[PDB]
Structure 1
Amino acid sequence: PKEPEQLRKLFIGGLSFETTDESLRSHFEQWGTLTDCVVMRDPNTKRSRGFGFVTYATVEEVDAAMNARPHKVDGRVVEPKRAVSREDSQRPGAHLTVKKIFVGGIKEDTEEHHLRDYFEQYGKIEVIEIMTDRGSGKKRGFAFVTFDDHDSVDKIVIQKYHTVNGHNCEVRKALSKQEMASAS
């Protein structure tokens, strides 16, 4: 396949105890050709860890699978998520289900239309907030964007580069005030 394996792969959380490679495949093959399908197990006990991965031949097929939520596998509602790489999985909050992104390093003259013209393609935007110092009114160089669907956030943050108001910016899942403090 032309597109990277990491972007063709979904984490499937909350599997029934009973789900196997074969039953997971039988379900998710409805939305495309699977190049990989695995239920993770504890080595010695071989018991399911309750999650697995499915990988499609194309990202378009991944998108079709996410568009078909909610998914019931072997009688249990499961939780498919964009697969976060092992490296990125080390970061605080990498696996949270959130609807808001932090957008860091935006120019002083960035306005909401700049953020819409990059982010609307990923999903329905509910809130845009370009952050200022409350007292001085000075722009602080970051914004928060809130979407309607956590998968919009997940599709965004697995990518490396994001161009807003002409220049790259860094985009991460939003951590709460207390989550920021616990990550320090």
Structure 2
Amino acid sequence: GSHMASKTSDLIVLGLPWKTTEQDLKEYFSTFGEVLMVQVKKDLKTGHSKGFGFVRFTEYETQVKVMSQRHMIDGRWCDCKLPNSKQSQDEPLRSRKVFVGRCTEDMTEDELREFFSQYGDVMDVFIPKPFRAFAFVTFADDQIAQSLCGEDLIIKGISVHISNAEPKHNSNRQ
């Protein structure tokens, strides 16, 4: 070849004026690529304690040129970079189940299964209560749930992390 790349992730958008909306971030992040989505992130009981956001692009290069310098949003200097929970993977394991992270109340069990069915076929989705940053899903094949883990997926515009589910009952069949 003549170039290189690496696994993709969302850029954090630190330093927000705590008042800019979510779209206004995509309204400017389009200066680098096509911006698959954006998702402002903050607290869960105050709604006011992380003062940052997330943005995601169609390619990896578009996630390494933004972090090369700062940016001005709504008249406030901010920064973009790689968070402390990604760009640190290699491979998942075999299963018919998968796990989800960074989940939100904007989605639900059916909507997950309606989005996971594009990669093959879904058996079910599960989410315990009360609502938390995670979920689970089951697939119809032992290869779909082994080729979708760690892929930092997206649901209706909510980037969700994915990881290796672990059995609280029964066992694998490898």
TM range (shorter): 0.3 to 0.5
What TM-score do you get using the length of structure 1 for normalisation?
0.40
TM-score normalised by structure 2 residue count = 0.42
Instruction: From the two aligned structures, give the one with the greater helix fraction.
Output: 1
